[PDB]
Structure formats: structure tokens, C-alpha cells
Design an enzyme around this catalytic site. Structure first.
Site, PDB file in Angstrom:
ATOM      1  N   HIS A  99      -4.557   3.278  -3.532  1.00 48.56           N
ATOM      2  CA  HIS A  99      -5.198   3.879  -4.681  1.00 48.56           C
ATOM      3  C   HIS A  99      -5.068   5.396  -4.575  1.00 48.56           C
ATOM      4  O   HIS A  99      -5.253   5.954  -3.508  1.00 48.56           O
ATOM      5  CB  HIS A  99      -6.685   3.451  -4.729  1.00 48.56           C
ATOM      6  CG  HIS A  99      -7.437   3.969  -5.924  1.00 48.56           C
ATOM      7  ND1 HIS A  99      -7.523   3.275  -7.111  1.00 48.56           N
ATOM      8  CD2 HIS A  99      -8.117   5.125  -6.123  1.00 48.56           C
ATOM      9  CE1 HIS A  99      -8.220   3.977  -7.988  1.00 48.56           C
ATOM     10  NE2 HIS A  99      -8.590   5.104  -7.412  1.00 48.56           N
TER      11      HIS A  99
ATOM     12  N   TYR B  62      -1.346   9.390  -9.340  1.00 46.64           N
ATOM     13  CA  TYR B  62      -2.661   9.286  -9.978  1.00 46.64           C
ATOM     14  C   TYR B  62      -3.699  10.238  -9.373  1.00 46.64           C
ATOM     15  O   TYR B  62      -4.879  10.124  -9.711  1.00 46.64           O
ATOM     16  CB  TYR B  62      -3.203   7.861  -9.855  1.00 46.64           C
ATOM     17  CG  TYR B  62      -2.417   6.861 -10.636  1.00 46.64           C
ATOM     18  CD1 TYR B  62      -2.509   6.819 -12.011  1.00 46.64           C
ATOM     19  CD2 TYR B  62      -1.514   6.019 -10.006  1.00 46.64           C
ATOM     20  CE1 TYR B  62      -1.719   5.988 -12.739  1.00 46.64           C
ATOM     21  CE2 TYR B  62      -0.723   5.172 -10.717  1.00 46.64           C
ATOM     22  CZ  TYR B  62      -0.817   5.161 -12.087  1.00 46.64           C
ATOM     23  OH  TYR B  62       0.007   4.346 -12.837  1.00 46.64           O
TER      24      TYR B  62
ATOM     25  N   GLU C 131       1.322  -3.706  -9.862  1.00 50.51           N
ATOM     26  CA  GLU C 131       0.032  -3.126 -10.127  1.00 50.51           C
ATOM     27  C   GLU C 131      -0.996  -4.234  -9.877  1.00 50.51           C
ATOM     28  O   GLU C 131      -0.820  -5.370 -10.339  1.00 50.51           O
ATOM     29  CB  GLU C 131      -0.049  -2.630 -11.564  1.00 50.51           C
ATOM     30  CG  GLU C 131      -1.455  -2.229 -11.978  1.00 50.51           C
ATOM     31  CD  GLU C 131      -1.504  -1.582 -13.338  1.00 50.51           C
ATOM     32  OE1 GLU C 131      -1.233  -0.354 -13.428  1.00 50.51           O
ATOM     33  OE2 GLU C 131      -1.819  -2.301 -14.311  1.00 50.51           O
TER      34      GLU C 131
HETATM   35  N1  LIG Z   1      -5.057   5.414  -9.267  1.00 51.95           N
HETATM   36  C1  LIG Z   1      -4.265   4.431  -8.832  1.00 51.95           C
HETATM   37  O1  LIG Z   1      -3.921   4.308  -7.684  1.00 51.95           O
HETATM   38  C2  LIG Z   1      -3.605   3.480  -9.798  1.00 51.95           C
HETATM   39  C3  LIG Z   1      -2.781   2.460  -9.301  1.00 51.95           C
HETATM   40  C4  LIG Z   1      -2.109   1.585 -10.148  1.00 51.95           C
HETATM   41  C5  LIG Z   1      -2.244   1.782 -11.523  1.00 51.95           C
HETATM   42  N2  LIG Z   1      -3.066   2.830 -12.046  1.00 51.95           N
HETATM   43  C6  LIG Z   1      -3.113   3.126 -13.498  1.00 51.95           C
HETATM   44  O2  LIG Z   1      -3.820   4.329 -13.830  1.00 51.95           O
HETATM   45  C7  LIG Z   1      -4.744   3.956 -14.873  1.00 51.95           C
HETATM   46  C8  LIG Z   1      -6.168   4.389 -14.577  1.00 51.95           C
HETATM   47  O3  LIG Z   1      -6.488   4.058 -13.222  1.00 51.95           O
HETATM   48  P1  LIG Z   1      -7.189   5.123 -12.255  1.00 51.95           P
HETATM   49  O4  LIG Z   1      -7.675   4.351 -11.077  1.00 51.95           O
HETATM   50  O5  LIG Z   1      -6.448   6.383 -11.993  1.00 51.95           O
HETATM   51  O6  LIG Z   1      -8.432   5.554 -13.190  1.00 51.95           O
HETATM   52  P2  LIG Z   1      -9.870   5.016 -13.742  1.00 51.95           P
HETATM   53  O7  LIG Z   1      -9.726   5.239 -15.201  1.00 51.95           O
HETATM   54  O8  LIG Z   1     -10.280   3.665 -13.220  1.00 51.95           O
HETATM   55  O9  LIG Z   1     -10.973   6.067 -13.152  1.00 51.95           O
HETATM   56  C9  LIG Z   1     -11.536   5.820 -11.858  1.00 51.95           C
HETATM   57  C10 LIG Z   1     -11.224   7.148 -11.208  1.00 51.95           C
HETATM   58  O10 LIG Z   1     -12.422   7.480 -10.496  1.00 51.95           O
HETATM   59  C11 LIG Z   1     -12.126   7.515  -9.097  1.00 51.95           C
HETATM   60  N3  LIG Z   1     -13.133   7.031  -8.127  1.00 51.95           N
HETATM   61  C12 LIG Z   1     -13.816   7.892  -7.363  1.00 51.95           C
HETATM   62  N4  LIG Z   1     -14.620   7.242  -6.518  1.00 51.95           N
HETATM   63  C13 LIG Z   1     -14.403   5.967  -6.787  1.00 51.95           C
HETATM   64  C14 LIG Z   1     -15.034   4.933  -6.117  1.00 51.95           C
HETATM   65  N5  LIG Z   1     -15.929   5.224  -5.164  1.00 51.95           N
HETATM   66  N6  LIG Z   1     -14.676   3.680  -6.493  1.00 51.95           N
HETATM   67  C15 LIG Z   1     -13.781   3.505  -7.462  1.00 51.95           C
HETATM   68  N7  LIG Z   1     -13.217   4.530  -8.104  1.00 51.95           N
HETATM   69  C16 LIG Z   1     -13.487   5.788  -7.783  1.00 51.95           C
HETATM   70  C17 LIG Z   1     -10.816   6.794  -8.916  1.00 51.95           C
HETATM   71  O11 LIG Z   1     -10.160   7.357  -7.781  1.00 51.95           O
HETATM   72  C18 LIG Z   1     -10.089   7.120 -10.200  1.00 51.95           C
HETATM   73  O12 LIG Z   1      -9.486   8.399  -9.999  1.00 51.95           O
HETATM   74  C19 LIG Z   1      -4.868   2.486 -14.855  1.00 51.95           C
HETATM   75  O13 LIG Z   1      -5.404   2.020 -16.080  1.00 51.95           O
HETATM   76  C20 LIG Z   1      -3.494   2.026 -14.432  1.00 51.95           C
HETATM   77  O14 LIG Z   1      -2.559   1.982 -15.501  1.00 51.95           O
HETATM   78  C21 LIG Z   1      -3.767   3.671 -11.165  1.00 51.95           C
END
Ligand SMILES: NC(=O)c1ccc[n+]([C@@H]2O[C@H](COP(=O)([O-])OP(=O)(O)OC[C@H]3O[C@@H](n4cnc5c(N)ncnc54)[C@H](O)[C@@H]3O)[C@@H](O)[C@H]2O)c1
Ligand SMILES: NC(=O)c1ccc[n+]([C@@H]2O[C@H](COP(=O)([O-])OP(=O)(O)OC[C@H]3O[C@@H](n4cnc5c(N)ncnc54)[C@H](O)[C@@H]3O)[C@@H](O)[C@H]2O)c1
EC number: 2.4.2.36
Lengths: 515, 515
Positions: free
Chosen positions: A21, A57, A140
Site C-alpha cells: 500500500h 499512490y 489490484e
Molecule cells: N494506495 C495504494 O497502494 C493503492 C493500491 C492499488 C490501487 N489503488 C488505487 O488508488 C485509488 C484510491 O486508493 P488509495 O488507497 O490511495 O486511497 P483512499 O481513497 O482509500 O484513501 C485512503 C488514504 O488514506 C490513507 N490512510 C492513512 N492511514 C490509513 C490507515 N490507518 N488505514 C487505512 N488507510 C489509511 C491511505 O494510505 C490512503 O492514502 C483506489 O481507488 C485504487 O484505484 C491504490
């Protein structure tokens, strides 16, 4: 039902199933304390199997272009986890085909005991799997928020702790993916750039050339004129010697292109834009001609050394500074040496990352070969594959068109293995807007059959053709790695009596032998 | 079995099932006496449901380009005939799936009692049906040679009896297909052409201009120079007045293009080629720039009147004559007024036929929009369709790349119906060589949402992107013919500060609302 939406071939139960992540600055430390929920069918925790895909991300949400990158953490589920691979991303189709309640959110239903009992195969939970993206072999993962509470979070990397400039830490990490590979040291490039700029500014002939600058708003055509002479003068500097050699032949790297780029930049940078990295980057990112300074052309990153990259950036920096007073609106002063360099460095990194990622070159799979006004491509991926090891026929569709005026297709050159792999002359034809033209195919010098259309073929705007190549297999013997003459089919366009030696425009479609 | 190779939706038993066959000169009369056999799996009599598609099979086999066209005959089977539509053209697959003997020729098996008993549904025989071609709505019928003996043959048309020049009779017949439609009278065009050439040759200023012709081998650059002045002078003639107006704006119709074409022709015509229509046509058909004289550009045939076509041909004829002594090898004498005109007339007809046939314009279905160095297209036909009348989501893939250097994608403009058809901001993204970039989408002036990539997007040789647009339906109500703002999605490339008003390169993908 489940056959329509679930890919059994790609699903599996795993112990200690791990994934990655990417998170934002400020949360790299707090996320390691636990995963917790900060359309509805898709509300869930997102991870991927690729850590460098996760890295993307991590950029500050309010400065996605130039902002600071936080980090990547590894999340592990203890026990057995069932990865259910989905063949569709439409939740209504999934809930329906899986007979789920067509009302409750899919992901919400994914974290229920019943659902885990049904498709978990004994695993403690189920994580949805989906292809990461078109052009990616990554996947994913979609974790149910409640089940995600069981995840063990470990740190992969904190780009901020690396203490590097811009997004250097994020891009150099991703570059680790390919160990060709553009693995450049931006600290070295950043330092060489400053040194070179310094040496250029403080330089007899260059300062002399600067003297003659109209140093006032002049016409665009005069600006480019001054800039091309300035460029020429600047390239003589001992510090830009390698760049002088590397940019000597390819026209894309010529001075006119540097001057063109330089004036284009000077033209779009007002004062507020220039005092913001995010604003500079957004402004520069939509400009054409960045390939001249990056040294990227014909499908290759040519400036792939810290030394040559730093000379190229230093050179355009000096020119942007010259262009500002001639065709601009601010004080080139800092901009050219400040944000211009910071922003362009970032852009190089974006493009180098693209070329470091596995991709299909033109004419491969369904990727178009663009050349001389024509656009050609295999109709489908299957078409681009010539199967072997059987007696029989196969057909291969090739799409053809040209951008504007009517351009001819002289014919098509096809590789053979006389006796084993032959052209099926009766099924090989080309349809132009539906007119099915038959072809006269003849074996020629070197294991190639040249087929010509029985009547004139022209393609262009509104006119397209489908080249259907039929092949014949005389035995079940597999074609071997030496058998076929080449790995491409050559569609021939117009004839140009150039180099006093007439030749055709060549449009290649690359194939693979399989089975 | 039969589901895998037979299309029941498209098969049918018909009484007096008729179809068309095109034949060569010399056989139009003898074929009406009866059908008789003159890979093996496909040995059979070939007809089509389209008479104008049949027409294309009537040209003298030894002169396929310029040769004489014979005719089209109608073949009718008395009684009941079963048209079995095939979903595949691979005979081994057919014989296997239909459980046929995997050894005997498919078509041979098609004329057996057993086979007719099994798939004939009481019809006296079975005729195989296959799509005529990609880009055609016509079908191809494959008659078993023995059963074909029962066919009643009637005459549709004999192009030779029409007693017209070249392939005029064949092309004017095919033109009957569309009753836009380029339905030109070539006799009128042929006659106007001769008259105009005559008036030009015998003309003060033109003859004066000719005087100054170096009338000897000069360089190519000098040839074009003389030719551009000659062209300019020739366009003042009262006879070429309309052409002067119609060719004034579009750069493709400029004098430099006429001169370019003229010298190119003079360069490839040696004496033996010039004394053969087939050889002239084959020679000219591979030359670029024919769109300048045909007046074809931007997807439209602009010279669509007998008057303007005849002026264009007369003009290039005069210039080819001038170009021959400067950059040629024969005696322009006859060539320019003889075979040049005969051959070019033929080529116009080939291209007009293409534009008369139903075809998809760039950006429609899977046809590429080529512009500013970019190539964009809907990944599949389904992608180009926005379905309506349901609450839910849909995804649409758009392929994007650029020909060479890295060019930016600023973002994408999408038509909406606020409330009914919206952008699904979480599923809308763009993957560049696999890097899945998220997008910031915002509603703007006029029922359009502009989405921008969170990080820089550049495409070019080796770098491609997949734009995945996700839409959301808030109700089951069908979108109506007024609802959506426009019929295209606009991908925006680089920004050009042109016309002192900055604008982006626009790449459109056209869609259709359905269901
Ligand atoms: N970030 C990733 O690694 C990842 C991986 C695969 C796909 N994606 C894609 O990016 C899009 C959005 O995902 P995302 O995860 O960046 O955003 P999200 O819209 O789910 O926002 C959650 C955000 O808050 C953060 N966060 C902080 N503390 C957290 C905690 N304690 N528990 C859970 N989350 C916490 C996450 O790191 C993330 O940056 C997805 O819809 C998907 O298409 C993201
Ligand atoms: N000619 C047509 O109308 C037609 C229609 C659909 C598809 N096709 C296509 O063209 C390709 C070849 O077909 P084709 O028919 O032109 O050529 P073919 O190879 O079957 O040759 C037969 C030729 O001999 C002629 N012939 C003369 N007298 C005949 C007679 N008494 N009985 C039967 N045939 C007689 C036919 O007119 C035809 O020109 C096909 O393989 C198919 O792809 C042709």
C-alpha cells in the site's frame, strides 16, 4: 454464475498473504499502527502486488505533480487468505452472478461470514483480485475494511526519510524495478546542472552573444533566430561537448527545437506560475517538444547518462533565460535556474519511468505502427500470433488507414518457410471500405512472398482497409527458432524516388510464433 | 458443435433463393447456359448478395487494373434452398464441429444428400453463407458445384455492351449503389478534359510560359519552380476558373502539390510503361499526392462536379507534359494527353468508389483519429457505445499514443447529463505503460466534465495510454435525443499558443447511445 465473474485459474488460498500500500506524507508512521477506514460497492482498503506501483499512490494529495511522496508499507494477513480473482469489475454483475444480495454493497458483502464460508475455501477471509491496469501485469487487491483490521503493517520505504530533492526518492525506487533500465542518479545530475549553468553564464563568447540580445520584447520569429545562434554558441562550450556530439545527427535534438521549446516556455510562465513548483509543472507538462531536451526519439531515451542529461537541462535553462525577455513576461532571473530546472527534472522522471515499464513497441500486439501518414495495427492480439505445430490454415487481420489525403498500399511482404509455412493465395486479400480486393502473390528472393492488390488500394481519412493474410501449414512440425526469415510482416505504402534509389514506405507488423 | 460454427440467427430456408456472380469478358453469354466447374475444402461456385460487389469480379484477369469488365449475372435456385450461415471460415473447425468426415473437402460434403438432409431443413440444397468482408454488410455465398447445376442464370448487366471507355461502365454501375454519392458522368468529364487541354495549349500566356521552359533536363528543385509558375499561369485561364476558386484555400490543392505530383509522374514513366495502360496505372497507383489533383482531403471528395474534375485533370495533364522534359525520360507528347489521362481517370474512380461505400470516419467504432502526431481509438466497438435505460456503471477504454517524441495528454472532456449520466470519478483513470494515473474531474461550463491526470501523461513511440472512462447512471430512464451535450469525447493533447489564443490539440472519439 460464478463462471461469468470469477477467474478460478487465477484465484488461490495463501498463508500470510502479503501485498503493498502506498501512503501520503504524515501517515507512513500512523498507518503501521493498523488499517482502518478513514461507489459503495467498492468501499475498501486498496493494495497491489507491486511495491513500485504502490509508490505512485504516495504523493501529497494537494500537490500531485511536484509534491512530496510519503511511502510504501507491506500489509500481511496471518493465517489463510482466499484471493478471489474477478473477470469483471461491474459490481451488479458480480453480486448477481455470485447470487449475492443485489442491494448490499459488494465489498460489504465480501466481509460477511457467509460469503467467506462460500468462496473462502477455508481461508479466514477473501480479498478481491482484479487486473491492476491495461498495460500492467500487476494486480489490484480490494480488502474489506473490517477484515483489513487483521493486517500486520510493516514499512517498505519512506521517501521522505531518504531526504532527497523533488520526487527523486520515489522515482529512483521505482527505477529499481528494472534493476533496458534508466537508473539515473538525480543528485549527480542536479549538481552537474548547476555547475554547467554557472560555467556557461560566466563565459566569454556566451556573455558576448548575450550582449547582442535585443533584451526587449521582439517578434517570435526573431526570438527563435537569436535563440538558435545562442544555442549554437553555447554548444561550443567544453562543458557541453558530449551533448554536441549526441545531438548532431537526430533532427529532433537540433537547435531549432531547443529554441522552439525555450520560447514556448518563456511564453507560458507568468510570475505566479513561476513562484510555484506545482504551477510551473502543470504549465510545462502540456507543452510540446519536450523530447528535444530529454533526448527522446524513435522509441529510445538517448540521453541516458547523468553527464549528458545535466548538459541538456543546463542548456535549455540558459536558453529559457534568454527567451524570457524576448517573448515572455516575468524576470527570467530565478525561474530559468530555479523552478524551470526543478519542474523539468520531474518531467524527465515521469517519461523515463514510462520507458522503464514493460510496453509493446509499435506494430506489436495491438499497438499501432505510425509512419508516413499511415496507421497500421493487428486487429487483435490473436492476429499477431502465428501458431505452429499443426497442418491447417490461419487468418490474420491487419488494419490500415492514412491520416488525410488518399495514400496507396503497393502490397505486402510476408515471411515464409517454403513447404512448411506458406501464404494461402486464395484467402489472402485486402478489403478497402468493404471492396474485397483479390491479390497476386509471388514468392521472391529470400523466403518472402510479395502480394500485390489486383486493383489500386488507397487509404486515408474516411477510407480504411483490412488486410487479411491467410497462411497454410503443410505439416504438424513446429516452426523452429531459425525457420522463418523475419518477425514481421511488411506493408508497403507509396514509392518515393529518394536517395536516387526508389523505395517504398514500410509499415511493419511484428508477430510471435506460438504453441 | 453446430453452435460453435453455425449462426442460426442468420440462416434461413428460401424459395427461389437468388444471388449474384460477376464474370469476365467473353463469358457473360456462355455463363447464362449454366453454372459448371471450369484449398479443396473451398472449391465451389461464388456469388454474393450484392450486385455491385459482384461487379468487381468482372475485370479481365490479365489486366486487373485497367482491363475491360465483363458483367454480372443473377443465379436462382428453384424450390427451397437452405442458407447456412457460418461463424468461422476454418474448414477443419467446421467439419469437426458439424461432426463431418474430417477428410473429405468441406464443400464436397456440402453437396451430399446426408448433409442436405441434416442441415437443409427440407430445402433442396444448402449454400454456405459467410460475411463478405470486414467493412461490408454484404455476404458471400458458396455453392456446391453439383447443386449449382440447378441454377437459373439471368443477365444483370454487360459492361462491354454499354460501349463506354475504360472501366466507366463498371464504376458508374457501382455508383448506382448510393443512388452522399459521387455519381459522375465520365463521358462528360472525358470530353471536357480534352477541350480544356486544347484551350490551354493554344493559349497566349501559357504558350509564353512554355517558351521559357528550360526544355532540357534541369534539377528537380528547378523543375518544381518552373512548374509552380506554369501552374499559376494556367489557373488564370477562363476554363479553369472554378478550379481556381475551389483550390484557393485548402493547402493540399496548392500549386506546389500539383508541381510535386507532376514531376513525380514524369519521373516514373519510361517509354514502355507509357505505351501500356496497365503499366501506366500500376506505376501511377503507388505515387503519393494524388489527393491534390483528385481534390480529396479531410475525409471529403471536394471536386465532385464533372466541370471541376475535368479542369483538375486537364491541369495536371498540361503540367505532366511540362515536367517530362525537365525531370523525365520519354516524349511527353502522347503520354500526358493519352495514357496519363486514361490512367488517372481510372484512379479517381477507384477512390470515389471507396468514399461512396459506407465506412466509419475517424474516431468512430474502432477507427483511429489521427491528428497532431497522436493516434486515438476506442479499444473495442462496445467501448464506443454508451448504453442507456438502466441504473448502473459502464467503462469505456480509449487507446492513446503518439508517433515519435513524447507528447502530453492534458486531459479529457466528457459529455454528461447532470443527474442522469455522470462521470464516475473513482473509476475514471488513464494508464500509461501500466502506471495507473488517477484523475481530478470537474464539471465545467456546458454539460461537460473535464478530467485532468494527477501526474503528467506523455505518449509517443514505445509509450501508450489506456483512458478508462467510467460513467454512472442515476435512473433507468433512457437518455433521449437531446439529452447529451454532444456525440464525442474529446481527448486534449498539447497546448499551442496559436492565433494569439491558446488552444489544445483535440482528438475526438465518437459514441452512440443504445438500448
Ligand atoms: N494506495 C495504494 O497502494 C493503492 C493500491 C492499488 C490501487 N489503488 C488505487 O488508488 C485509488 C484510491 O486508493 P488509495 O488507497 O490511495 O486511497 P483512499 O481513497 O482509500 O484513501 C485512503 C488514504 O488514506 C490513507 N490512510 C492513512 N492511514 C490509513 C490507515 N490507518 N488505514 C487505512 N488507510 C489509511 C491511505 O494510505 C490512503 O492514502 C483506489 O481507488 C485504487 O484505484 C491504490
Ligand atoms: N465472381 C463473383 O461474383 C464472386 C462473388 C463473391 C465472392 N467472390 C470471390 O472471388 C474469388 C474467386 O471467385 P470467382 O468466381 O471470381 O473465380 P473462380 O476462381 O471460381 O473462377 C471461375 C471463373 O470462371 C468463370 N466462369 C465462366 N463460365 C462459368 C460457368 N459456366 N460456370 C461457372 N463459372 C464460370 C466465372 O465467372 C469466374 O470468373 C472467390 O474465391 C471469392 O473470394 C467472387
Amino acid at each position: 454464475g460464478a463462471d461469468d465473474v470469477v477467474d478460478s485459474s487465477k484465484s488461490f488460498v495463501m498463508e500470510n498473504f502479503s501485498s503493498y500500500h502506498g501512503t501520503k506524507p504524515g501517515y507512513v508512521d500512523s498507518i503501521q499502527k493498523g488499517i482502518q477506514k478513514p461507489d459503495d460497492d467498492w468501499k475498501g482498503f486498496y493494495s497491489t502486488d507491486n511495491k513500485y506501483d504502490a509508490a505512485g499512490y504516495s504523493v501529497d494529495n494537494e500537490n500531485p505533480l511536484s509534491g512530496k511522496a510519503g511511502g510504501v508499507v507491506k500489509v500481511t494477513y496471518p493465517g489463510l487468505t482466499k484471493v478471489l480473482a474477478l473477470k469483471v469489475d461491474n459490481a451488479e454483475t458480480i453480486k448477481k452472478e455470485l447470487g449475492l444480495s443485489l442491494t448490499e454493497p459488494l465489498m460489504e458483502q465480501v466481509g460477511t461470514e457467509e460469503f467467506i464460508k462460500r468462496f473462502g475455501d477455508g481461508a479466514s477471509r477473501v480479498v478481491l483480485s482484479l487486473p491492476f491496469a491495461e498495460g500492467s501485469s500487476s494486480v489490484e487487491y480490494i480488502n474489506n475494511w473490517e477484515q483489513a483490521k487483521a493486517l500486520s503493517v510493516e514499512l517498505e520505504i519512506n521517501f521522505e526519510t531518504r531526504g532527497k530533492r523533488g520526487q527523486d526518492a520515489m522515482y529512483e525506487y521505482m527505477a529499481q524495478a528494472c534493476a533496458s533500465c534508466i537508473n539515473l542518479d538525480w543528485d549527480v545530475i542536479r549538481d552537474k546542472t548547476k555547475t554547467k549553468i554557472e560555467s556557461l553564464k560566466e563565459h566569454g563568447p556566451i556573455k558576448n552573444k548575450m550582449s547582442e540580445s535585443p533584451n526587449k520584447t521582439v517578434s517570435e520569429e526573431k526570438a527563435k533566430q537569436y535563440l538558435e545562434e545562442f544555442h549554437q554558441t553555447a554548444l561550443e562550450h567544453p562543458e557541453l561537448s558530449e551533448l554536441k556530439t549526441v545531438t548532431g545527427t537526430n533532427p529532433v535534438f537540433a537547435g531549432a527545437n531547443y529554441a522552439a521549446w525555450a520560447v514556448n516556455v518563456a511564453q507560458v510562465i507568468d510570475s505566479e506560475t513561476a513562484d510555484n513548483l506545482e504551477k510551473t509543472t502543470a504549465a510545462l507538462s502540456i507543452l510540446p517538444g519536450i523530447g528535444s531536451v530529454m533526448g527522446i526519439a524513435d522509441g529510445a531515451v538517448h540521453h541516458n547518462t547523468e553527464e549528458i542529461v545535466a548538459q541538456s537541462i543546463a542548456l535549455s535553462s540558459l536558453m529559457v533565460a534568454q527567451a524570457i525577455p524576448l517573448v515572455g513576461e516575468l524576470v527570467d532571473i530565478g525561474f530559468a535556474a530555479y523552478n524551470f530546472v526543478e519542474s523539468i527534472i520531474n518531467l524527465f522522471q515521469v517519461v523515463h519511468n514510462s520507458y522503464n515499464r514493460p510496453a509493446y513497441s509499435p506494430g506489436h500486439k495491438t499497438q499501432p505502427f505510425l509512419h508516413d501518414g499511415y496507421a497500421v495495427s493487428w486487429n487483435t492480439v490473436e492476429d499477431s500470433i502465428i501458431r505452429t505445430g499443426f497442418q491447417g490454415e490461419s487468418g490474420h487481420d491487419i488494419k490500415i488507414t492514412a491520416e488525410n489525403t488518399p495514400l496507396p498500399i503497393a502490397g505486402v511482404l510476408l515471411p515464409t518457410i517454403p513447404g512448411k509455412l506458406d501464404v494461402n493465395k486464395s484467402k489472402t486479400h485486402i478489403s478497402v471500405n468493404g471492396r474485397k480486393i483479390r491479390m497476386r502473390c509471388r514468392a521472391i528472393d529470400g523466403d518472402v512472398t510479395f502480394c500485390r492488390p489486383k486493383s489500386p488500394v488507397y487509404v486515408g481519412n474516411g477510407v480504411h482497409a483490412n488486410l487479411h493474410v491467410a497462411f497454410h501449414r503443410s505439416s504438424s512440425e513446429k516452426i523452429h527458432s531459425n525457420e522463418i526469415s523475419s518477425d514481421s510482416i511488411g506493408v508497403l505504402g507509396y514509392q518515393k524516388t529518394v536517395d536516387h534509389t526508389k523505395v517504398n514506405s514500410k509499415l511493419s507488423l511484428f508477430f510471435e510464433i506460438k504453441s
